[PDB]
Amino acid sequence: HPETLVTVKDIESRLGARVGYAVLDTASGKIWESYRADERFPMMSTFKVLACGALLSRVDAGQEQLDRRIRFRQSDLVTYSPVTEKHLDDGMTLAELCEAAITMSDNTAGNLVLETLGGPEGLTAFLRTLGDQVTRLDRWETALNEATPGDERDTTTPAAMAATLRKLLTGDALSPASRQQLIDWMEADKVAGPLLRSALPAGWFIADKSGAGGRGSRGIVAALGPPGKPPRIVVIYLTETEATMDERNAAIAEIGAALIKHW
């Protein structure tokens, strides 16, 4: 849509950033709008949706139990672990860890979920079973946020991420209760206030997950739409900028506002 392209090109000029996005209609399976959709961007914490989807896939296959309790130590804590650092003595269930990784973006929680999958290599192998030949996780938290330009480790493309999220969130990669559990966690996202949610019309559905990383990287993945209607997958990444957090937040929100205005 010409509206959105005006917005994104202004962001790229104002902030000096590389911006990419894709909007995928889940009812039709068609890309509704996109920009740099085949370019790579760092996933940052948006990988956590994929990690929890992979865990739920193992649950569905009888290989894993959501109420299994994980015990961990202070030595497992990485930067920004607001939930996991409270449970060094009693541990956490896998459901609680997924909830922490998605709703709070807890970094140790993300690592502990990854561990159940066989690490970044195991998550990448799960993505290949979904037909995603592009997305790759290579490192753990917090090194995966480094976002060195030209480094393809820990990246996706907006088109690849949108297609993979469709399969997880509205497709049949997961059982209906498991798919709804992933949606529930994403609906409960506590750390994406100033992004797509700031543009969302009253009463609309949104399930999302944000990310922030090195070299000004910022991003969000989401399913959103009017209530009771098939949603669209929205993927927005930006990187390589000196822009402030406030400016990067506003950029993503302005793209969302343009998408909403002509939904």
Numbering used by the authors: 26 to 238, 240 to 252, 254 to 290
List passages from the publication reporting this PDB structure.
The TEM-1 β-lactamase model system has been extensively used to study protein evolution. β-lactamases are a class of enzymes that are produced by bacteria in order to provide resistance to bactericidal β-lactam antibiotics through hydrolysis of their core β-lactam ring. We apply EVcouplings to computationally design variants of the model protein TEM-1 β-lactamase. To examine the structural effects of these mutations, we obtained X-ray crystal structures of designs 80.a, 80.b, and 70.a. Aligning these structures in 3D to a published WT TEM-1 structure (PDB: 1XPB34) revealed that all three have nearly identical Cα backbones to WT TEM-1 (0.26–0.61 Å RMSD over all Cα atoms).
We also searched for local structural changes by examining differences in all pairwise distances between residues, which showed small changes in a one looped region for all three structures (positions 255–257) and in a second loop of 70.a (positions 53–55). Both 80.a and 80.b have 55 amino acid substitutions relative to WT TEM-1, of which 80.a has 15 mutations in the core of the structure and 80.b has 19 in the core. The 80.a and 80.b designs also had a 4-fold increased MIC of aztreonam, as well as a 16-fold increased MIC of ceftazidime. The two designs that were optimized solely for predicted fitness (i.e., distance unconstrained) both conferred resistance to ampicillin, with the greedy optimized sequence (opt.a) having a MIC equal to WT TEM-1, and the parallel tempering optimized sequence (opt.b) had a large decrease in MIC (roughly 100X less). In summary, nearly all of the designs were able to confer resistance to ampicillin including a design with 84 mutations relative to its closest natural homolog (70.a) and two designs with over 50 mutations (80.a and 80.b). Most of the rest of the distance-constrained designs (98.a, 98.b, 95.a, 95.b, and 80.b), which all had more than an 11 °C increased melting temperature, also had increased activity on at least one of the four tested β-lactams. To investigate the structural basis for the increased Tm (80.a had a 24 °C increase relative to WT TEM-1, 80.b had a 18 °C increase, and 70.a had a 6.3 °C increase), we tallied the total number of hydrogen bonds and the number of atom pairs in contact (1.7–4 Å) in each structure. However, we did observe literature-reported globally stabilizing mutations such as M182T in every one of the designed sequences, which has been shown to confer a 7.5 °C increase in Tm as a single substitution. The 70.a, 80.a and 80.b designs also showed increased resistance to aztreonam (80.a and 80.b had a 4-fold increased MIC, and 70.a had a 32-fold increase MIC, see broth microdilution assay in Figs. 4, 5). There are five shared mutations near the active site that are in three designs (M69A, E104T, P167T, E168A, E240G) that may contribute to this increased resistance.
